[PDB]
Symmetry: C2
Subunit: 227 residues, 2 copies
């Protein structure tokens, strides 16, 4: 089930999208809760935003690479053109991320409206919440917004048995590593550097323990790198 | 007419051009039968080879990098970082190739400088090789956006035979002077040169226009109006 864990933790693809939303719409029918229905509607719109943009980027890059440009004769012209194309891609990616996070935010708002504690404990509830947070983490991670994933990942690992998920610890380690490197690169305080390095290592070690097991060749190796 | 042949000389080297140029130059070397010309030709060919090898290497490197699977590259920022690394590898190779090619072009010109007999320096073979070396040098600098550096080489180029009558030489000189004028405006630095760069840009822009379209044509009359406005 490590393959299934890894499959959840990536940018959305066509097959995963169809399986996820078929399963979630089935859960929505058994849950028979209007706020869950609305949260699911918003979550789907957010994933759609992402999928549409990622398809647009691939298509835009293909079209730009397939053009002849016989009037582009110089190296500096190709560099300038590639810089313009990258700026177009970035602007479209940012727009899509903002729209997707607004839909994810609305999905959370609808789940927040489910006040009954018995309903909040339902497996359907926890599954949708997990999916929303995971997609949000992935959308931020895709655009290198690693510090922004830290509070979302922290909320995610609190749900059910989500702390026992090696990818959640892998992304937390990565995000803390980024923060440690940001302290090193700026004129950042040493107390913060050590805090971030420690947290990175805690989650790196936990991720390793989770997928390979304690006292395995891989767990023993990562202990040595930290030392 | 021969405007197509003029335009064909004024670009980065391709295999069509390479084959024609070196077949013709090797034939001229035989008729000239001069050791310094032979050495200048050898250096010129090594310089063009440096460029040809590099432009072939870049295409091959880009193909190999684009054909790799990279199942571990899942994120937008990873692909951007990877493409930025690939572009730095390409840039370092291109600059190195230009540097080496200009050293060979410098040696070619230095060997033709060793031909001291003024009668030999007036030979059509001599002027043809000199023109080819300067032109390749200009194009190799222009490719890397070293437009100010092309100015002394274009000024030497147009001095040779009837080279002043070719419109691309004036087109590149106008472009290079324009770059200099814009550099003064952008850096707000010593402005006492601004009018000199602008004037030179306009002189060559007008001459390029006159050369390919003719004096008192719709295109020549138009350029005159933009300079006056």
């Amino acid at each position: 089930e490590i393959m299934e864990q890894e499959s959840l933790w990536k940018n959305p693809d066509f097959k995963g999208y169809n399986k996820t939303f078929q399963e979630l719409h089935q859960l929505s029918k058994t849950f028979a809760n209007n706020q869950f229905r609305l949260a699911l509607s918003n979550y789907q719109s957010g994933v759609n935003t992402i999928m549409k943009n990622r398809d647009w980027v691939e298509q835009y890059r293909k079209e730009e690479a397939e053009k002849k440009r016989l009037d582009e004769k110089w190296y500096w012209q190709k560099v300038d053109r590639k810089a313009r194309e990258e700026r177009v891609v970035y602007r479209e990616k940012m727009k899509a991320k903002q729209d997707a996070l607004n839909y994810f935010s609305k999905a959370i708002n609808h789940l927040d409206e489910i006040k009954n504690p018995d309903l909040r404990e339902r497996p359907e509830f926890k599954r949708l919440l997990s999916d929303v947070y995971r997609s949000w983490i992935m959308a931020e991670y895709d655009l290198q917004n690693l510090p922004q994933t830290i509070p979302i990942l922290e909320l995610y690992i609190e749900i059910d048995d989500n702390e026992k998920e090696y990818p959640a610890h892998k992304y937390l380690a990565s995000a803390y590593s980024f923060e440690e490197n940001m302290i090193k690169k700026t004129k950042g305080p040493d107390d913060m550097l050590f805090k971030y390095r420690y947290k990175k290592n805690v989650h790196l070690l936990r991720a390793t323990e989770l997928k390979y097991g304690k006292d395995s060749p891989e767990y023993k190796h990562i202990v040595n790198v930290i030392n």
